[PDB]
Write an enzyme that holds these catalytic residues in place. Structure first.
Site, mmCIF file in Angstrom:
data_model
loop_
_atom_site.group_PDB
_atom_site.id
_atom_site.type_symbol
_atom_site.label_atom_id
_atom_site.label_comp_id
_atom_site.label_asym_id
_atom_site.label_seq_id
_atom_site.Cartn_x
_atom_site.Cartn_y
_atom_site.Cartn_z
ATOM 1 N N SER A 112 47.540 46.924 36.123
ATOM 2 C CA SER A 112 46.564 47.085 36.993
ATOM 3 C C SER A 112 47.183 46.727 38.454
ATOM 4 O O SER A 112 48.196 47.186 38.855
ATOM 5 C CB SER A 112 45.318 45.999 36.645
ATOM 6 O OG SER A 112 44.270 46.289 37.260
ATOM 7 N N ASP A 167 38.342 52.975 30.706
ATOM 8 C CA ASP A 167 38.495 51.989 31.604
ATOM 9 C C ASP A 167 37.413 51.706 32.537
ATOM 10 O O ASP A 167 37.208 52.625 33.563
ATOM 11 C CB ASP A 167 39.948 51.989 32.278
ATOM 12 C CG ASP A 167 40.321 50.589 32.990
ATOM 13 O OD1 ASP A 167 39.343 50.299 33.808
ATOM 14 O OD2 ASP A 167 41.569 50.277 33.026
ATOM 15 N N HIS A 201 39.964 48.246 30.102
ATOM 16 C CA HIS A 201 40.991 47.670 30.884
ATOM 17 C C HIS A 201 41.638 46.712 29.939
ATOM 18 O O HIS A 201 41.407 45.441 30.128
ATOM 19 C CB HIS A 201 40.167 46.920 32.025
ATOM 20 C CG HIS A 201 41.309 46.742 33.408
ATOM 21 N ND1 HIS A 201 41.757 47.898 33.952
ATOM 22 C CD2 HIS A 201 41.530 45.576 33.758
ATOM 23 C CE1 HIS A 201 42.577 47.125 34.937
ATOM 24 N NE2 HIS A 201 42.463 45.877 34.755
HETATM 25 C C1 LIG Z 1 46.369 58.590 44.675
HETATM 26 C C2 LIG Z 1 45.702 57.240 44.376
HETATM 27 C C3 LIG Z 1 44.026 57.553 44.381
HETATM 28 C C4 LIG Z 1 43.009 56.658 43.953
HETATM 29 C C5 LIG Z 1 43.219 54.992 44.528
HETATM 30 C C6 LIG Z 1 42.118 54.195 44.574
HETATM 31 C C7 LIG Z 1 42.359 52.803 44.361
HETATM 32 C C8 LIG Z 1 41.247 51.989 44.045
HETATM 33 C C9 LIG Z 1 41.624 50.783 43.235
HETATM 34 C C10 LIG Z 1 40.454 49.597 43.020
HETATM 35 C C11 LIG Z 1 41.099 48.330 42.357
HETATM 36 C C12 LIG Z 1 40.823 48.212 40.977
HETATM 37 C C13 LIG Z 1 40.719 46.874 40.904
HETATM 38 C C14 LIG Z 1 41.454 46.139 39.700
HETATM 39 C C15 LIG Z 1 41.450 44.762 39.559
HETATM 40 BR BR1 LIG Z 1 40.760 44.214 37.776
HETATM 41 C C16 LIG Z 1 42.932 44.203 39.870
HETATM 42 O O1 LIG Z 1 43.814 44.176 38.869
HETATM 43 O O2 LIG Z 1 43.133 43.849 40.766
#
Ligand SMILES: CCCCCCCCCCCCCC[C@@H](Br)C(=O)O
Length: 223
Positions: A112, A167, A201
């Site tokens: 992640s 996920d 996840h």
């Molecule tokens: C080429 C890329 C396109 C998509 C990029 C969008 C990113 C959005 C991600 C949101 C974060 C998710 C949170 C996860 C947490 Br539980 C963690 O581990 O911090």
């Protein structure tokens, strides 16, 4: 800096895996997962992110490599935080080189946010790495990357990106769009996308078997 959880090499370390955990975690759970697939000549290093307020969830203080604001591609990203965390990762690599293991014998990975950090780090360091294992994650600060292959030291790095198809925190489509963008940033022949049916996840045993195979192929014995 509480010292990273380490899975040492049997007796002679000729390669290393630096793996960054995800939101709220310590390095310990992943270090034990890696002991279960360990190879005798490989040192496994799972540092711990510091406790910090996390904007996403009522500012709650928990381990995080950088601040998480939203779950959307349109969410603001913690640019100063990601870059500072990236500088800290490269210092951890440099320290391993001094310790005795060259950077091209080191795989950087994470889960992640730690996988997001590992991709960004690998693509911005002049430290030539052996490969990246990115689990259920995404490419952060994606808008900062110009068109075309990065060139740079890791223009040819091998990447294994894994993602569960159920996920709910990092939707599979985020990982998918990430690998496709990675394939325009480095040589696409060396990037592998694997998905896991039913997985959320989390991790699963087939995924750990694919990571082991990936690591052992790129970090084979030298003795
Ligand atoms: C080429 C890329 C396109 C998509 C990029 C969008 C990113 C959005 C991600 C949101 C974060 C998710 C949170 C996860 C947490 Br539980 C963690 O581990 O911090």
């Amino acid at each position: 800096t509480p010292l990273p959880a380490i899975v040492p090499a049997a007796r002679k370390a000729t390669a290393a895996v630096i793996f960054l955990h995800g939101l709220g975690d310590t390095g310990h759970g992943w270090a034990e997962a890696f002991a279960g697939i360990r190879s005798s000549h490989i040192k496994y290093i799972c540092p711990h992110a510091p406790v910090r307020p996390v904007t996403l969830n009522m500012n709650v203080a928990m381990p995080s490599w950088f601040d998480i604001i939203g779950l959307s591609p349109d969410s603001q990203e913690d640019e100063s935080g990601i870059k500072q965390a990236a500088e800290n990762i490269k210092a951890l690599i440099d320290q391993e080189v001094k310790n005795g293991i060259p950077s091209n014998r080191i795989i950087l990975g994470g889960f992640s946010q730690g996988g997001a950090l590992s991709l960004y780090t690998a693509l911005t360091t002049q430290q030539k790495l052996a490969g990246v294992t990115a689990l259920s994650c995404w490419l952060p600060l994606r808008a900062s990357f110009p068109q075309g292959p990065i060139g740079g030291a890791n223009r040819d790095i091998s990447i294994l990106q894994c993602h569960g198809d159920c996920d709910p925190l990092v939707p599979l489509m985020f990982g998918s769009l990430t690998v496709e963008k990675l394939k325009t940033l480095v040589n696409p022949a060396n990037v592998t996308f694997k998905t896991y049916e039913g997985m959320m996840h989390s991790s699963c045993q087939q995924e750990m078997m694919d990571v082991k195979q990936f690591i052992d192929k790129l970090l084979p014995p030298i003795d």
